[PDB]
Amino acid sequence: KLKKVLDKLRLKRKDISEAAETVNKVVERLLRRMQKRESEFKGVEQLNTGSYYEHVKISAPNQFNVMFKLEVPRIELQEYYETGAFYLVKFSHFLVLSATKMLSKFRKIIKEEVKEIKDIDVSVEKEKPGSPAVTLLIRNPEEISVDIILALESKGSWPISTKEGLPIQGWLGTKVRTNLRREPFYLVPKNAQGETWRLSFSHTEKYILNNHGIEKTCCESSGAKCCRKECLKLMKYLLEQLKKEFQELDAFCSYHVKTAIFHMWTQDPQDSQWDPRNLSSCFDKLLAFFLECLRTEKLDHYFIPKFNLFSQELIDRKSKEFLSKKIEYERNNGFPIFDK
Template sequence: MPPKEGLQDISPGEGTHGLPSPPPPRVPATAAAQRRSPHRGDRRRLRKTGQAPPAPRGSFPPSPPAAEPGPDPSRAPQRDRATARRGRPARQTSAVGRLPAGPAAGGGEAPPTPQSRAPGGRAPAARRRAAAPDGAAGTPLALRLREVLSRLSLGRQDVSDASGLVNQVVSHLIQAIRSQDGSFSSIERLGAGSYYEHVKISEPNEFDIMLVMPVARLQLDECDDTGAYYYLTFKRNPKEKYLLKFLDEDKKLSAFKMLQALREIIKREVKNIKSKKKAGSPAITLLIKNPPAEISVDIILTLEVQQSWPPSTQDGLKIEQWLGRKVRGEFRNKSLYLVAKQNKNEKVLKGNTWRLSFSHIEKAMMNNHGRSKTCCESDGPKCCRKSCLKLLKYLVEQLKMEYPKELEKFCSYHVKTAFFHSCVMWPNDTDWHVGDLDHCFQKYLGYFLHCLQKSQLPHFFIPKYNLLSLEDKASSDFLLRQINDELNNGFPIFQKSY
């Protein structure tokens, strides 16, 4: 795809575990180079090594480049202070260059970050944070983003009312399902998705509820080259004899048959609640009246299998530098989840395919997202990871409302996957300081634009599974153009209401 306005030209290639491999960032000048007398040769070398490049046309409103890490440039060297006392002007230790992007997942380099037209150097990070420890002040972009975030916050009473209504309906439903003929007597409830990950925006009107069924060991056979979809068969006669009636003529466990049986039970139990089936969705959707609107509850049939994750996941979940090797091992020792999901690439659509699900792991990562174990706890340091995710979710959501047909292929999972990759590329909590919201959002958005440009967004757990299929390249191109338009015009869509 040709480079778009407002985005740097990026050479092709792949980084570790399938991440797009962007060009190496410019190396910032060292503190020593900044303190040298500004002779002509030094100035030339400084321009070559550390001067920030001119901003691309699609840049944000003024947001100066960040100061480089290292000794606090706000403190003059001892020699300069002495010189100043003798009546001579002290040397200025200006911050040169931009914030290093940091290593990408698996050792690659981070993608380019959209830059701002900056009339001058950015204040040192320590000084900025001291001036605005709560992140209330900052650049015009930061103020605009925080204003948007304030509108996206969920009202406490609204959340309480909606969740109470959902809990009442789901509890009754689960009790009724368990009391049937035994087919689903072992199900357990697990909340998943944005509401339970605390990244839901605007309204508490969508809930994802997984009905988890423990099943004995299964044989998983890949049904395509994505590594995400599988046929399931029993290696021996299962202890759960009632599952035998859900086998198809090839002795495969039929997702279609199980979903159909579950849907019949739900329809009998919730006669006064509308239910619908979304095309291609693994969920049974309930619509609960909650004047003046409705609450959508997705009921997702999920199999829990106590066995090793399949080989397609071996190189995924590369969180060692972010959450740690120990945490990765704990996650990979958790049960394998599979949801009833039709694979549209099958030659003959029989409805007997299942897709790997990592909702339980994603929820755990979202709710314990810091490298330090106290990140965003009540008495711990705050970061802006979730704020950045909410902003990009909202941007894509608004664009989808404006262009529903052109962007129907996109969903919040694309945004969340890009978020996890960004957390790996910038693993430190200081990379997401709450006072640096504008800069952090630009980094994250830059990676997402990079993925759109290359039509390559690897599944976070299954690296060979590209969520931006080349078959849908036209959609990626369209979204890329729309986001660049927003960049060039200061995000006018944030001011619209639908």
């Protein structure tokens, strides 16, 4: 049933190999150019993030997220109008440290370097306003897009917006939380305007995805398999499928599904609440949770509790009612959309 769906979604070893080899070529070349050229980004380091590197990528290895992170000295942040997630930055050519001005130069560089690649078919997608990414389109023989995300790395204690965030205490525990919060935090040039950066915990999300159990042995070779990741895949696929069919759902993205499942994993911390034999119940309880988020217009950022991704501002009630009717439908008709 849903086992058969996960079979469909499962990536092919062959395709992983071919995608990776090409992506790594282009990324390595870009990374060397930021260093080898005596550029503004000299110290930059590679941090692979998102679904491919979390092993929750579905259908195809056709989308990759890579952070080019740059350790900067001390930087006083100032919260930008109480959102919790957006800040200005303060204290070489990009002055306040402007996101746009810095992203632009980052982009100019990438575009130059891509233009001198004749070993593989790779263009740079037109820029999306207030996206932090520079997006590459590889044609390979098949379509693969890579988001290259500039990131400022800060070693200070995390912002206060995140104090009550990351509520993993009853699940992954207090030591894990304290350790995670000793890791640096990241700022990416996603604008809200043009000088605003945004907090990133892609590194933390990646740790969580690969260390998701209350038992240390969850999903290891001498432990028991859970169905936590499988539920994430199924949920993402339901959203992808709906999204490709209904333009009404443009406001929604997979980060919403990811955020909600982090909350469900917190609410139901036991590995035995995610037994593979109960995949149907688990997926269903996840759907029930997501619908409650829509109904109540409430889905708090997992790291920044005061930041509501389902506020009226970001997403219209109509959009939410629309998605609810569509989820309710698929749920009460045996998920016919999984058959396209």
